[PDB]
Design a protein around this ligand. Sequence first.
Ligand code: NA
Ligand SMILES: [Zn+2]
Length: 875
Amino acid sequence: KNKIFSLAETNKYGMSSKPIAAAFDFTQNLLAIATVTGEVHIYGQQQVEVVIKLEDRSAIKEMRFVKGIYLVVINAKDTVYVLSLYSQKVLTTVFVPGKITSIDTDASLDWMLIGLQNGSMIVYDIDRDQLSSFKLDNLQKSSFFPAARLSPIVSIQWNPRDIGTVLISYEYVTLTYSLVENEIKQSFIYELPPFAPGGDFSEKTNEKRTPKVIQSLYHPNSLHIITIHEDNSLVFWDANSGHMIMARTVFETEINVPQPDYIRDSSTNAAKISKVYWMCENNPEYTSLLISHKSISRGDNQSLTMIDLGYTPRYSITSYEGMKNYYANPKQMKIFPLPTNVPIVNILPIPRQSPYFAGCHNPGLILLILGNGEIETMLYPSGIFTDKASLFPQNLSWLRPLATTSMAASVPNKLWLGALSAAQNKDYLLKGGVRTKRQKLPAEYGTAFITGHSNGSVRIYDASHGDIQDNASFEVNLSRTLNKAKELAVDKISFAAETLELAVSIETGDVVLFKYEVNQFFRRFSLNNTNGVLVDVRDRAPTGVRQGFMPSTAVHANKGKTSAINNSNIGFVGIAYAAGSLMLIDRRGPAIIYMENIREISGAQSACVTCIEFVIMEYGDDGYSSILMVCGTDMGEVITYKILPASGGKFDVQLMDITNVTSKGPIHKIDAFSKETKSSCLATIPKMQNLSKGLCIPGIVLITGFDDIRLITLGKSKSTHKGFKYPLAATGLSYISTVEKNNDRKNLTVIITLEINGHLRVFTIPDFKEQMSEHIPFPIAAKYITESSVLRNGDIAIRVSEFQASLFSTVKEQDTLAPVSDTLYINGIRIPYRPQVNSLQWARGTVYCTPAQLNELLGGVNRPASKYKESIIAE
Ligand code: NA
Ligand SMILES: [Zn+2]
């Protein structure tokens, strides 16, 4: 009933599925990340983010930004899509005649080279949506190995300084090809004589070998090239003479020389090479190689290796031996240990100097997408990994690193907005696009989101995209507060919205308290230093932050993991431990005012308290309101405590009673409302101050069990209950206002419920008359569904999966403005001049070719004008 309620999704957070591939455009300075189900997220400065969903739900293999206005996306079905960063829609879909095994594009060119399984190479005109007549047959079969198996094209790359030359690798031969002269310029075939050790994974060292090629790359100067093979061999060649300069691996050289008495001196089990990147610094004369390794076993066997080659000797005055010396004695080699044992699925360097040199021009950061969906960021060349949420839009923080817990709360905008105004994100990395202003009409309450991570970090921000809320956020790190590096996974979180206080529990059982406030402005700190349970960590506050969530106390009970926590809005914090202990702390102090193991009080077989809540209402029938701490146990028991203002501003704790309320344990949600006004009875400072008035407010407490809800009156026996067909995921009370008369404001208190399978319901209380019944529109993960939070205005924040959350509204009538999108493409940004062959490095030998001339070669003299408005715009 009630035309008042209607289910609608208001917002999405994180990603609807696992990230699988990424790309970056230097010119527009935008980051694109694609998922396993065909969605493409494009990010820019601050919170700029646009999502484009492909018709096909197939996974994305590769993406490239071209001409600064197009995004080329290729899915698993070898279907090529071309997206417009100008109109934010798909411009064309193309099915490729064959299996795509390699490609290459260039930010300044309209052409994409495509290698196929059959070893052929075709060229596609991205700008005019047409295939070129230019096609290459399998050169390996026709010119080098006719009797060999039909080889596919393993890799293709545009010559860094000459758009008219391309580097092509087949399995057993690599070669440079001139599109202008239409002929093979040079070839390179890596052969090992008998007794040559070869790469770490080389087999039958006794015979002659031609180890398959897995990748080919041009040296930034374009005069040398490297070929990497299956045995892990790294071979450097002079691109013009074809002379093989030197063959080596990460640990040795002269691997091409026969050594019948060779013995592998390695205390490190080899890791097969996955991919290689040739980087260069601001000044192209300095370069380095970044190498990734496919794991063996399954334990952190995925580290990155960097070989800094330093200054490249001048080509014209360096002998082959000089060059061999250059490659044999790197300026430096360092291994970058990956924080995780999870396999890397995609590596993307983030260029800082220009879009050239295959997008590796002075990258100060490397983006990594892991098989589990986590996204890592490693500073280059330092190798320092960072999880600073502030570096990218907040929606990406759900991935860096994955959230282990989360919640949402209705917070009063009064002080909330003041805190956000002073917390704008001023140090994000991306610069592209413009965030479209989406001003949200004022409200007394806003929505705060809070996430915990395996990292030990906790992110805090507003779920809205308003002027002040959109780009504001806070991040607190327990690794600092605790001077710890392992065992930091956030287990539970409690956020007191009225006093902006925070309680964080970690996997060890320790709990740290924080509070939004002004800040005070050793390396030996350890919780085990003192014998006290309350450890002062006030001085462990973040250095340069004038204000924010500052730490105060660390709770070191040494009582195991927590079973429940609740930072009240009245200075008290309740903490329960799986082992049975129950603790009550008064922030005024701070001090522990109560601590007993509830197992010695249970009438049932209660092992621990599974839920804690603070209320101010009449206990039983004593005629006045009291401060009551209500606790639900894993066995359906409810324990009620009275918190009484005592002498010297302290408080006494009095156990009122323990009652076995339901066989549907455990109790995981507690709430309350007044019997007459049906307004919230959760404890608040103003309510606490009113105690001196001696008012009496009888109320009803809601006890949420496994699959049943109990309505009870504290201190009384009578009650009611409502059972559900499916287990309950989350419940909560909502307070709504409905106009109807002439300007009459009639409020309504409803309870909203979410079952673990995704079904959502709204009921009026205490009669429990259903007002709405609908299922969430998509599959939801049982694992995270229980983190969901019902909000004060009828909204509900739901965690759908490991990387996704959605905000839903249940109240139909709402002040909704038509959806709007951010701007991605910015006009007038000039794409720099591509590097050219240094007449100073290799004078002559090259054949200058302008893009105009390349366009004629590949497109023909009568190349049509494109049908895209984007073609002319991009000039
Ligand atoms: Na926001
Ligand atoms: Zn349903």
